[PDB]
Amino acid sequence: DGVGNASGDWHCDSTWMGDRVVTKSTRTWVLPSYNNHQYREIKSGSVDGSNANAYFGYSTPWGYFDFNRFHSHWSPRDWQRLINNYWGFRPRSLRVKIFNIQVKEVTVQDSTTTIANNLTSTVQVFTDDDYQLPYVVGNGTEGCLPAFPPQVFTLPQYGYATLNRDNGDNPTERSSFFCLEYFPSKMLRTGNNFEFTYSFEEVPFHCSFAPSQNLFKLANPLVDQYLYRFVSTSATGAIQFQKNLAGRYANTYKNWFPGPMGRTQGWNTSSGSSTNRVSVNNFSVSNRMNLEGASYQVNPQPNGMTNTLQGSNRYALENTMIFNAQNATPGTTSVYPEDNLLLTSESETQPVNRVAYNTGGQMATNAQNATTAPTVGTYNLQEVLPGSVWMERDVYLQGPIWAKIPETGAHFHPSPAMGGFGLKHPPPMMLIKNTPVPGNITSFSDVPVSSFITQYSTGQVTVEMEWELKKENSKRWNPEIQYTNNYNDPQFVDFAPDGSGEYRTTRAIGTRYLTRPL
Amino acid sequence: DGVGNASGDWHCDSTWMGDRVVTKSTRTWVLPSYNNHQYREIKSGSVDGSNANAYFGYSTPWGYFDFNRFHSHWSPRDWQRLINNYWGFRPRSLRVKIFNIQVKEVTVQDSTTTIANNLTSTVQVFTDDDYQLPYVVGNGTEGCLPAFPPQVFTLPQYGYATLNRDNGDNPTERSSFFCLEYFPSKMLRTGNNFEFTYSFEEVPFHCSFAPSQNLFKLANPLVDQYLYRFVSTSATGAIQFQKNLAGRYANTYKNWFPGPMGRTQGWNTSSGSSTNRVSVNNFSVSNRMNLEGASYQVNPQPNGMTNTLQGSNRYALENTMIFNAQNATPGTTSVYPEDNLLLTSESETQPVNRVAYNTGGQMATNAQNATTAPTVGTYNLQEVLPGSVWMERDVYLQGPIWAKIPETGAHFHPSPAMGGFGLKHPPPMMLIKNTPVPGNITSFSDVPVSSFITQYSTGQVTVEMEWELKKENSKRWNPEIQYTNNYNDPQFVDFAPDGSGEYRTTRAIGTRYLTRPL
Amino acid sequence: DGVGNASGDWHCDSTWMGDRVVTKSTRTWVLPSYNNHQYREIKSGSVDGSNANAYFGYSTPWGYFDFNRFHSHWSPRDWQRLINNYWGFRPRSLRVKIFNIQVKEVTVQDSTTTIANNLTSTVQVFTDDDYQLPYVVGNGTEGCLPAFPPQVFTLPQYGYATLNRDNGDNPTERSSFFCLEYFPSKMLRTGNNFEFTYSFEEVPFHCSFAPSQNLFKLANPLVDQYLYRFVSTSATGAIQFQKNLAGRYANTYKNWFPGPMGRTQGWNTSSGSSTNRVSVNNFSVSNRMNLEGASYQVNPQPNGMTNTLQGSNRYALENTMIFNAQNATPGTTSVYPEDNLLLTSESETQPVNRVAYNTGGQMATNAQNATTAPTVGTYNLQEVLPGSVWMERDVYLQGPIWAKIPETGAHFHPSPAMGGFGLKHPPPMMLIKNTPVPGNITSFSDVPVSSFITQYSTGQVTVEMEWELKKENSKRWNPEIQYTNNYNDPQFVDFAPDGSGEYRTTRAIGTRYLTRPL
């Protein structure tokens, strides 16, 4: 439209309206010129002594928008206002918009950089609606709209790993190359704006409630069962039985079973550091799966377990999600202690899921004769059994919203190990890059031009989601537990900028606070 | 209708029409008089030293039509034209028709056989629409319309095993006898024709595409994760963490897991014969399940694995489908080398399923103290876990189309271990027999007549199926892999008759050629 | 319909109606069971010392109907009545019909054959409408409806050669196998009949007239030309000219040129046998073309030449069509003298085409200086030049009607070297075979049945063509030449059966009798 006329406004709010809440977030982004407008074949061999780190892929000159973290849509006070009052929620719509673009031309002429703004330069933008490109948004990768609205962020570079050969850095005949210029983009100059809308498929609500009943204590503790149980054998080998009394839950007949489990190791946090074994490189002793002759660590393991038992300091670290209070810089290989790290705890599920560092149970190892005695054998892993129930991992303010389910054809219970909603058709990926502008060419050459003017672009992005809520209707009498701002001797305010202007976040707020009778 | 007037024509073609293809095949069959028009109680005791080979059942005087193999509807050139251009397909309809029947009366009088044609003899035909009879069509049994149209085939005899007692050849009180004359058939003389139509329930498409991304390399290899991971313990027992860098897929947090697995043994094909252990009777060392006190080999194991790792000669033979190039005769107990055998390979799934001869992974065996060190224990079998994905076995031109799901009431993921579509109500079984004509009886006898005129029948059968296709829409740039007629120094043409007139087929054409970004 | 009711009548006549003539011919055929209902891969290596005789192909169990010879539609008296009165003709329609079928079952039981007729057996019939099969009808092959209506004929076996490798009997990766059962046929029992109609594309008339003017004598022989011609050089090197007088056709300026030519060798017929060189194996000294490293004799050479010069006994045998008076048996490798052979002569074209055993002309070999003298060099081959005219080979009563033009994409002047009409879509091929009836099978076997009852079929075929004629309108005064029954001391009547009942034909009647002023 016009140079001296704004393309859009800054909308950033929330609007609770009964069983729906619409959130809105605007942010300023900056897009570098990655790979000097080229495609490069990136590849790696086995690093760290693990050929699972060996890949082969392509880095493109595009950047993408990632809105896959909760704190990109919710403020800490609107999150709290949700987890204290509702039993669940699920996304219903999405509507992204890019506007107020500005392309800047950088020039380092004379060992001195001068930033002037180009008014005729464009920016390319397209959304992958049919899922024809490798999805990279739902894998816990950095680069999402910052948590704090004032913060400006750089868009991350697009790239993807494709099939490599024999755990090496070479390709196979099936390795594919996707050209992103082969998609119909839209071009934008300073006066234009891009819009895009989407609507989620039905997905089941997330359950933001914790159970207030043990799964193996569902029976009435006053009435006895009309069922008997084999208790022992007499001297005559004759089998004897005994009735299941009331309150004796160790012996009652059950109807439902806890869910899957896979033992991990447990490590004690600070308080008990003394107990933990000294100097142990976990890699060698971690839970790992093999895929094509390579060993990959499967953190955070499949759903159906609790990393900790409420009341203890021991932790199943490989079944845990570990974030970082203070954001970090790319390429950091520094070793950090637990202090500035937010170890999430899923213990409000202990009533239904099993601890990840204990044996799942015991079963029989043989057959008793007039000779051999009955023997039991504890097991460390048990998968899904018919009639089992479990609770899924919880979502955090600083955690991921959705994940894309791989379209292989067959899958069981599509719920991402990192929490969130599993989707067959998740929000499209929105790529963007700066259309290249050639330097001073002066003669023909069937060779492509490699001299480009260095540029970068800035702009705003507004993303407005709509969520559906599930009202809590409990007849609990006494008061419940809520998420509260409980600090002692505060030297700073949490979820707010400190003296220098850097945003602080010392807590990981989850979602399971309210309760429900199993 | 009439003797000197044909009941139907010979339709045999294919007709591609966008997202649908209709195939049609006609063939000539011959029906012997099995069991001299009687029902016999067939039974066997433990043979080969395995009481699992002990059964009890009934052989009937009926024969049936089996269209449960792909190469009964597709030519090698129409198969190829499908697997190179589509991402999947599924059957939509069926329409069988029997016509141009001819009953012949054989007579060996005077040590010399004279074949004359009986014009008044009938043939009985009925389709089991309610699934009231034991289904025997989807179990990989011979007897299907030949691959080559010119070939004439004999219909196989119907029979079934019912409950036997204590792994013996005796019946139980629950053993059932089904009388097939107790169904309303239709009778046909030379001028009549039988028709029958059917339509499949919705079934999910088969996925004829291979993934072009590893399941554990879905993250962007340029951006790092905002998650940390327990890496080791300090001398103070204090736990230390480290950030998940980019491209280090051995350590990233994953969202999805590979599918089920059950270790089988792996044997090296020719090239590596030297490595294989010498003289091993597999039975004793094979994967077996127990059902009622008997050990059965479970080949080809459940879905979710790859029999081989692309680039190697090693094979998980018990997880493999093994066909035969040159068709064989009934009762052959000869030992064959790999040469004339088509060992199918499911490696275009290696990116998502695990190899069947490697350990599935490692997990923890204990709990580390200030005393005990962390220990891991490799596992050989792991079943379905929540959030796992796998790809189903592929279909072959020479393999089965569908299978009937047992109507027990409870089942998980109904997909036949041998590939194809699992159906609750599969195409009805079509039985047929020659109505008996008595010899010269001359006096009453309350005893049934046992003297019959020997006869046989011939005729044509046309089966026309309709399939639905799933168009491929990929934005891959470089060229894909296709199924091509790549032979070197051909001494004969494949998929064509040789000097003597015998049909040759040296390859097993599968379905997974195209690719898709996971 | 019915057994005791005829399917069709015997129509065999001609009906002249102005500018159209409709011919009709019925005949009785017999169809053997070729290849015992099988497909065989036929192949040959280099035979006769020529690797051009090495092929690789397939013989099928089908037979076909061939109506590609003129004497299958015309009687000698209706042919004569055409070539004496019209200036040309061309086919307009076609309409074949098969009826009154009868399948017979042969039995050699007891060293004694008994032919009984099977009333339930069928016969399969289909026409290749889209030209998807190798066409073999227009290559001068035997097997066409006999010349004489009373004669019964056996249908010839279908087969075709496909690509062979390096002039050997092995196939290439491109060698194709066509299954004829893969086409939708129609089945016929004794009471049924098959019909089929077709209409030719526009094709230019054949020109059944000879020119009555030399191509180089078109000018008026009374008037002189206003053009001069370089005649010589004076002693001064000065060039001199002279006017083109009247009647001096050796020197006139011409406007049109004779057509293509390629010198062959000329051999004298009987009268001059003495002159011919003694004992010469032509193969080594014949006109041959090379295609893929093999030498093939190109008889009868391309159009545009006359095999003989009217008034001489010399013959360009390789540019000649040689038929046989008395029909012969298959596999005869006997050497025959000219006597019972009909050597066609194309001399009524000598006014426009050049003799095939003379040098085509002379041209210049150098450049004359004050030193070198002018030299000429006779040429033996000259192809098409702009502004050239020629006349095509003539058609004979015993010769072919049409030919199919290969669908390569590029071609020049599509007129078959053997005469007739070149067609892009010629009359479809009509294949037919006896549906197989199995012997006494008694047990299942996944192996195809190989025991068949020996049968053969008989029936009638009526083919009715419509032709368009071009009326002659000449203002010639004196009488023309006609084809007349001019024999002297006839010991038998020509074109009629002799004492034994064998049809005689001592002449090859062509088509060029009438004349036209060039």
Author numbering:
A (entry chain A), B (entry chain A), C (entry chain A): 209 to 726
Manuscript excerpt for this entry:
Adeno-associated virus (AAV) is a small ssDNA satellite virus of high interest (in recombinant form) as a safe and effective gene therapy vector. AAV’s human cell entry receptor (AAVR) contains polycystic kidney disease (PKD) domains bound by AAV. Seeking understanding of the spectrum of interactions, goat AAVGo.1 is investigated, because its host is the species most distant from human with reciprocal cross-species cell susceptibility. The AAV5 clade also includes AAVGo.1 (18, 19), which was isolated from deceased neonatal domesticated goat ileum.
Cryo-EM single particle analysis (SPA) yielded a reconstruction at 2.9 Å resolution for AAVGo.1. The structure of AAVGo.1, solved by cryo-EM to 2.9 Å resolution, is most similar to AAV5. The AAVGo.1 capsid has a similar protein fold and surface topology to AAV5 structures. The capsid core, comprising a jellyroll fold found in many virus structures, and a single α-helix (αA), is the most conserved feature of AAVs, and AAVGo.1 is no exception. The AAVGo.1 core jellyroll has the standard topology with a backbone chain alternating between two stacked antiparallel β-sheets (almost rolling into a single tube). AAVGo.1 and AAV5 capsid proteins have high homology (94%). DE loop (VR-II), which forms the outer edge of the pore-like structure of the 5-fold axis, protrudes an additional 1.5 Å compared to AAV5. A double serine insertion in VR-V of AAVGo.1 leads to two dislocations of 2.1 Å and 3.0 Å in the carbon backbone compared to AAV5. In conclusion, AAVGo.1 amino acid differences account for displacements up to 3.0 Å in VR-II and VR-V compared to the atomic structure of AAV5. AAVGo.1 residues Thr477 to Ser482 are of below-average order in the sharpened maps of AAVGo.1 alone.
